[PDB]
Design a protein around this ligand. Structure first.
Ligand code: HEM
Ligand SMILES: Oc1ccc(Cc2ccc(O)cc2)cc1
Length: 137
């Protein structure tokens, strides 16, 4: 289930972080509005850009922590507040997060693998709720 999936993702985190983010950017190309430096690049080109590798991994490092601290796919209020309050998220709305988790669930649903895609969909919904409750528009 969900806890095992966190262990699976962590076991190959660089590869999952990159592949899931690329799945997001390719499903929702207008999301590059927030990622102007990733425009006009193939997947292989992006995976050779230092900040793409570094930042993607740091994002999924924290995403796996927030998942791990959750109870029944419901994140901590402190983790939602950190996500709303981060200088780097000043732009964003809950729709940006909903799209990331739609892409993550579809990636899991297409993978060869026994991911608990249902639990990740709930986690994305519940994180969106926590973000809205903690002040994200
Ligand atoms: C649970 C989901 C997410 C987590 C854990 C998270 C975490 C992070 C972290 C740790 C950073 C700092 C990266 C660094 O500077 O090395 C970051 C930066 C950023 N995040 Fe998020 N993030 C999440 C979702 C999103 C979403 C959905 C978007 C936009 C659609 C987004 C946009 C950004 C941007 C634009 C930056 C800074 C610019 C950049 O690093 O390229 N984040 N995020
Ligand atoms: O180089 C970066 C890549 C992504 C982000 C935020 C983020 C958003 C969605 C995602 O699936 C992974 C990361 C920040 C910096």
């Amino acid at each position: 289930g969900f806890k095992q999936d966190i262990a699976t993702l962590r076991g190959d985190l660089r590869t999952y972080a990159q592949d899931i983010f690329l799945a997001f950017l390719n499903k929702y190309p207008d999301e590059k509005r927030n990622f102007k430096n990733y425009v006009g690049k193939s997947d292989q080109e992006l995976k050779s850009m230092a900040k793409f590798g570094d930042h993607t991994e740091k994002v999924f490092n924290l995403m796996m922590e927030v998942a791990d601290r959750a109870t029944d796919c419901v994140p901590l209020a402190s983790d939602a507040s950190t996500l709303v309050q981060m200088k780097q998220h000043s732009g964003l709305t809950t729709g940006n997060f909903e799209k990331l988790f739609v892409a993550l669930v579809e990636y899991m649903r297409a993978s060869g693998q026994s991911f608990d895609s249902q639990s990740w969909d709930r986690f994305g919904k519940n994180l969106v709720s926590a973000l809205s409750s903690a002040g994200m528009k």
